Symmetry: D2
Subunit: 264 residues, 4 copies
């Protein structure tokens, strides 16, 4: 009766379905897969990547960047929603091959520094190659790259270092306010009385309020289905998208229903 | 006209005035200096150290531990109020010579991991030897060592990872509630509109409320004068001590007066 | 045509076949599996663990330590042959649950710090949870725990930080010289002209000489079959064991034959 | 009788005497001070910095880079001779302000990661702000930036991670072979029987041989006086420079004389 074999982190095939760059605004592009968001922001002094997807998407991300005429040495900064394997996967590899820097909060940095191991909820089930954060950022801090300002809004819950990012792009000269909000889901989390996360419910609730007040004309999420995006239909991909008010309100209903039946 | 020489971190002589162990409760001992708190908690399965003082206090701390009959290999865990050079100084050296582990929150851990460099307010002026946190702890988490439970209460302000520690000791069988609260001071901090700490005032204000609600019969602070302790007078050292309500209220008045004249 | 799924590191079932502690000398015990070595050395002031095996062996190792009456807080130090997933697997978990310290050379430490990712030969195929080395040790340095002295002998090759450990135990008062030598194999390695390891052949050759001159009356290896141990047969497990001279000489023949046909 | 105050690392004033860029070859420039070498190599795809000097030279280095028309975001890579405070001082600050990457061997990386603390010979006397290495390089590995190839040659001694760097520049179309060799000095080191560095003498001796065989038409050292450079006299600065054979031979004589009188 030998000990069990290691099991790999296997996801849906749509999460790994490569797609060509889809334009969101004048400078923002979706370069991930059909069901996993990876945002590229092209500026005058370099490019910014927000999330990367699964660990095996590093090559694909570099291909799409090459399609936009962004050389590896042109990727200046990597930003994260939260340091889980399905969003921060290729960060370590992308750092070795692009010469980019990684800005994250303290909670995301320590999790990224241990490759997602010892997760508060998942343990060691979803390990990815570890990467080191180069710059610790605080709640409400401003990151500027080539004239575009990225504001961090801490929204703890899914992970302690969950972050929503907001910046103002243009839609052919028309200023658009874009908010990239993190996941508000608690898949399988023990919500009440979790010894690894005592103030979990208080963090989630305040985070629901933080997403509602985001300056946002167009919302995006690490999973496009969470904000009702559909990357397949190209031009019509943002048609049935959700506001921030709808996003936080629908996520809270699921949280409360889950919180209620957890007591049963 | 050469570039200026490096300058060392020099403190008051009372901060480095060694003192014999002073008993606080049945298991809690003060083993630091006259004006710098270093708390030793002796249990059945090992000892816990809360803060260490200046970097040059490592030898003195080990001497006082030897006086209490605590061998180096008996120090099991090191806890921190905040990872500044005058409180977390000897941590790196104490880890090499005691085989102890260090529990800290994410914000304190990243600061401890870079030896206090790149401080949000002090820059590189107060560098100390870096040490690595072994266990990341969350707000309200419980650390237990030999039957004594240590609860963490996040109180950001002085540093982003400022933590107050509470535990229940005895005073000859009589249960006493001890709270070791961090500094609530902002010495020279730019409070309003600090780009390195945008939500600084909101963190301080909520932290004033957090210290008021601490379960506490006897309060201690990293600087004994802040809670009106006087380690010199031995038995009478806790006579004119302050409550948590008085501590947070007096610190807030100074904060507001400082906040008010900062606008001038 | 989606991107391929992650694959887990799967090994032979004998590598994960738990076994009861098998005594090697008066203080040295084998507490790993049938085909994976994990050595426990019990002293007067604590215990030392050499290697741990696969990542999923942490619980089993703690059980065997409990069988020898070694509490988790009695494990003082963890030593490594090399920081590959099949030998340094449970180190990160064993540190969280035993309060132990990890001594390794610089090369092993950086590899352990990135969880075996970005391997010089294996890439990211064999990732394990990352752990941090607490004490950097040099070639020929002495580690002492409870009167037993452990000498490190650098033997680069399999990994840049490969280390053989030697110490003198007793066999009922009779002093025995034990050498725990690392693997001398290069499974699938590109030997000549490897850009990630330019001086690879020079390191291997000098390492063959280093193992020959080890003070050794009884040799052990991370894979028991490499030194012709057979952990199943209990008392007869060390019968057909190899000397250090035979071990290094047989490994060199395979290296040269592999080096010769690599040119073809 | 209080404990002593911390003391700062104070050097000679010539070590901090800023100087304008002095041209060494078509692409190599000296941008440090009069008695501390900091080499800038300008290529088609970016710039490379070799060493930085004292920690307070970060601003000066960026000024000289601005004089050569090298923006901060144009510094792609930082290379180190050894991670002591007087050569690797501004690395941490230069990483935050240039978006550059740091390549170092394992031994230099761990020392750089702890800010030079716990030195094998100096203890905590010469602490500098810690920085993290982004890419671990092996002995003889090739680093290429914009068509210029940098070869690492490990030469342990002064520190375990001491590295000499060689590359081929031009002197108006004429190919020149430049070797930047590390210090071969052991100032105050205990050479024979040092428990922190057991094989110290063997490392130094083999390192004397490694510097002799360096492909070198023009040698430079972290301290210009060690190779008989004189940065003050501008055009005549490389007049009385030493070969590699002379450099290693003169350093060995001092080592042996020091080794001989250490036995007395
Ligand atoms: C770690 O990755 C996730 N979880 C899993 O893949 C497994 C472990 C599972 O929960 O079944 C996780 O969190 N995600 C999110 C998210 O909203 O972030 C959603 C929607 C669910 O999928 C990924
Ligand atoms: C970094 O150490 C401190 N600051 C200094 O020593 C210098 C830099 C200074 O501010 O003049 C700091 O913070 N302390 C506290 C505290 O309450 O924590 C008090 C009361 C003031 O002294 C120390
Ligand atoms: C990373 O673990 C090893 N390699 C593998 O499991 C796969 C990747 C494989 O090479 O097929 C590795 O090295 N080992 C050794 C050793 O001597 O250390 C031997 C004998 C072969 O197995 C393990
Ligand atoms: C750590 O910096 C050094 N040492 C000191 O500054 C003090 C501590 C001292 O030894 O008196 C050190 O090593 N250097 C070298 C070198 O060759 O690298 C030389 C020539 C001497 O100066 C610097
Ligand atoms: Zn997730
Ligand atoms: Zn997800
Ligand atoms: Zn402080
Ligand atoms: Zn203080
Ligand atoms: Zn291996
Ligand atoms: Zn193996
Ligand atoms: Zn030096
Ligand atoms: Zn020097």
């Amino acid at each position: 009766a030998p000990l069990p074999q290691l099991r790999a982190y296997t996801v849906d095939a749509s999460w790994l379905q490569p797609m060509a760059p889809l334009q969101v605004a004048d400078h923002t592009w979706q370069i991930g897969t059909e069901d996993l968001t990876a945002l590229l922001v092209q500026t005058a002094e370099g490019a910014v990547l927000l999330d990367g997807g699964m660990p095996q998407m590093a090559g694909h991300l570099l291909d799409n960047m090459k399609l936009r005429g962004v050389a590896p040495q042109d990727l200046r900064l990597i930003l994260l929603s939260h340091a889980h394997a399905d969003h921060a996967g290729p960060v370590a590899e992308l750092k070795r091959r692009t010469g980019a820097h990684v800005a994250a909060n303290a909670e995301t940095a320590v999790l990224l520094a241990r490759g997602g191991s010892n997760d508060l909820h998942f343990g060691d089930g979803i390990t990815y190659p570890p990467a080191s954060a180069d710059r610790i950022i605080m709640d409400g801090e401003v990151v500027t790259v080539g004239g575009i300002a990225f504001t961090a809004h801490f929204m703890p819950g899914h992970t302690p270092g969950s972050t929503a990012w907001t910046w103002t792009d243009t839609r052919d000269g028309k200023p658009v306010r874009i908010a990239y909000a993190d996941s508000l889901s608690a898949p399988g989390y023990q919500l009440k009385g979790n010894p690894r996360y005592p103030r979990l419910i208080e963090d989630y609730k305040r985070s629901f309020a933080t997403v509602r007040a985001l300056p946002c004309d167009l919302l995006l999420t690490p999973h496009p289905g969470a904000s009702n995006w559909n990357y397949a239909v190209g031009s019509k991909a943002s048609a049935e998208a959700l506001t921030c008010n709808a996003y936080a309100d629908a996520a809270e209903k699921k949280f409360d229903a889950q919180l209620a039946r957890e007591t049963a």
